[PDB]
Amino acid sequence: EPVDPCFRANCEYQCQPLNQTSYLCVCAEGFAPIPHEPHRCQMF
C-alpha cells in the first residue's frame, strides 16, 4: 500500500488481526520477528 502497511496497529509488512500474542502487523518473508516483538523484525 502507498500509505502504511495495515495503517492501524503500526505494521511493517503484512497484517494478522491478533497475531498470537500481538495486535495486527506481522513480520514478512525473510525477517525474524524479535521475541519481544512480532510486528517488528531484525532481518534473519
Swiss-Prot record:
Residues 2-42 form the EGF-like domain. Glycans are attached at N19. Disulfide bonds join C6-C15, C11-C25, C27-C41. Endothelial cells are unique in synthesizing thrombomodulin. It is found in: Membrane. N-glycosylated. The iron and 2-oxoglutarate dependent 3-hydroxylation of aspartate and asparagine is (R) stereospecific within EGF domains. Interacts with ITGAL, ITGAM and ITGB2. Interacts with thrombin/F2; this interaction switches the specificity of thrombin from a procoagulant to an anticoagulant and antifibrinolytic protease. Interacts with ANGP1 and ANGP2; these interactions significantly inhibit the generation of activated PC and TAFIa/CPB2 by the thrombin/thrombomodulin complex. Interacts with PF4; this interaction enhances generation of activated protein C. Interacts with HMGB1; this interaction inhibits HMGB1 inflammatory activity. It is linked to Thrombophilia due to thrombomodulin defect: A hemostatic disorder characterized by a tendency to thrombosis. Extracellular region (481-515) contains a binding side for alpha-L/beta-2 and alpha-M/beta-2 integrin. Endothelial cell receptor that plays a critical role in regulating several physiological processes including hemostasis, coagulation, fibrinolysis, inflammation, and angiogenesis. Acts as a cofactor for thrombin activation of protein C/PROC on the surface of vascular endothelial cells leading to initiation of the activated protein C anticoagulant pathway. Also accelerates the activation of the plasma carboxypeptidase B2/CPB2, which catalyzes removal of C-terminal basic amino acids from its substrates including kinins or anaphylatoxins leading to fibrinolysis inhibition. This is Thrombomodulin. The chain holds residues 364 to 407 of 575 of the full protein.
